[PDB]
């Protein structure tokens, strides 16, 4: 989470009913506009940002939430339009020992902006004596672990998510793939539609 | 997430203890020695980090020496120049908010008696 | 080392009241200070997170907040737990410390 991986998509034609059609997903839940609708629309990009968050705040990364995961680390703007789609990963990602290769970010100075990463490792500390890059009573690595095991709960289990961002800029759009294949009937008065040709 | 503390016994003075702390679910990255003397208000007397920074009591300095087992998820306390003072109770603590300006979940609490 | 000063030594309330004990600071801390509860045989728990927020370890309704010089803890008219010394710890200067603490019975 703290390093939110960010991937710039573009100049491609995506399936998005792809995702949809297995359905088996915690969430899907799309703020922006309806999952059936994707398929036809043009956006010039989309980000797809994907983190591994535990299953209690899958809920936070949503428009103008509030939490810790969503305010210190990953934050998303009233105004963000996207779908966010999660799924549970207890046996692909948890170990038995204790998979300590997750890290989330529990105390941060200054809230942060939306759609912004601080990959930074700089002791936060709320308080006076002056706390240096060595922590200390109130000084704290700023990226404290998460801990994941098979045995926890469900709500606990990591839940890996993606929140696809697709956005439109002046320029021309690239990202955009309906599929709508009929094939064309010949020597007949027929309604006919093929690229754009009605 | 249970805490179990021992080793804690009656002691000759200037004897030297070992505290064993066993930490169950949870890591020794962020962990604190908290004491209550019997009959009397609690005194904080020890904190260890992540950076694995040791910073002693201000009342005593140096006669606990904190040993944070991180690989056998365990910690352990010196003891050194043993006084009246340093009887009491002792408790493993996560802290709250890390030992954000104090304690969370606690052990059950040692007793170490000093006897002549 | 800040002094922490605790009041009253001793209270005794009932049910369906709100239970006053202040504690005060020698030097005031702008928006920090810790409450903890303790039974007979029983593990302190913490009841203020160092004043981050109003604090768990207790139902909402038991929020007690004070600042700078004058803190002070107090208990909603809910039904009270078995009355508890309760304690206040420093929340800003190693060594973290505990106040004295009030002595709390049932009559």
């Known amino acids: 989470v703290y390093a939110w991986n960010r991937k710039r998509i573009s100049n491609c034609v995506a399936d998005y009913s792809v995702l949809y059609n297995f359905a088996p997903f915690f969430a899907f839940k799309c703020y922006g506009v309806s999952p059936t609708k994707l398929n036809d629309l043009c956006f010039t990009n989309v980000y797809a940002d994907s983190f591994v968050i535990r299953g209690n705040e899958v809920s936070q990364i949503a428009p103008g939430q509030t939490g810790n995961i969503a305010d210190y680390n990953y934050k998303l703007p009233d105004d963000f339009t996207g779908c966010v789609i999660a799924w549970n990963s207890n046996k692909l990602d948890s170990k038995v020992g204790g998979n300590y290769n997750y890290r989330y970010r529990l105390f941060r100075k200054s809230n942060l902006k939306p759609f912004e990463r601080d990959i930074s490792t700089e002791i936060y500390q709320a308080g006076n004596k002056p706390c240096n890059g060595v922590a200390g009573v109130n000084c704290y690595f700023p990226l404290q672990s998460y801990g994941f095991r098979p045995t926890y709960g469900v709500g606990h289990q990591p839940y890996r998510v993606v929140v696809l961002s697709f956005e439109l800029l002046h320029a021309p759009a690239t990202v955009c793939g309906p599929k709508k294949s009929t094939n064309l009937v010949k020597n007949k008065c027929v309604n006919f539609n093929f690229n754009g040709l009605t | 997430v249970q805490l179990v503390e021992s080793g804690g016994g009656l002691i000759q003075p200037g004897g030297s203890l070992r505290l064993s702390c066993a930490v169950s679910?949870?890591?020794?990255?962020?962990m604190s020695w908290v004491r209550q003397a019997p009959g009397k208000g609690l005194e904080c007397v020890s904190v260890?980090?992540?950076?694995?920074?040791?910073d002693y009591a201000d009342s005593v300095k140096g006669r606990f020496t904190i040993s944070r087992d991180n690989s056998k998820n365990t910690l352990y306390l010196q003891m050194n120049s043993l006084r009246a003072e340093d009887t009491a109770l002792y408790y493993c603590?996560?802290?709250?908010?890390?030992?954000?300006?104090?304690?969370?979940?606690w052990g059950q609490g040692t007793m170490v008696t000093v006897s002549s | 080392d800040i002094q922490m000063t605790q009041s009253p030594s001793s209270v005794s309330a009932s049910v369906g009241d709100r239970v006053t004990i202040t504690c005060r600071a020698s030097q005031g801390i702008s928006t920090w200070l810790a409450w903890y509860q303790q039974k007979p045989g029983k593990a302190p728990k913490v009841l203020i997170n160092?004043?981050?927020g109003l604090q768990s370890g207790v139902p909402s309704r038991f929020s007690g907040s004070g600042s700078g010089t004058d803190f002070t803890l107090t208990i909603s008219s809910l039904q009270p737990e078995d009355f508890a010394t309760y304690y206040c710890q420093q929340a800003h200067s190693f060594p973290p410390t505990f106040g004295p603490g009030t002595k709390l019975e049932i009559k």
């Open positions: 160092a004043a981050s």
């Open positions: 260890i980090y992540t950076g694995g920074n040791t």
């Open positions: 679910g949870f890591t020794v990255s962020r």
């Open positions: 603590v996560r802290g709250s908010g890390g030992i954000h300006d104090a304690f969370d979940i």
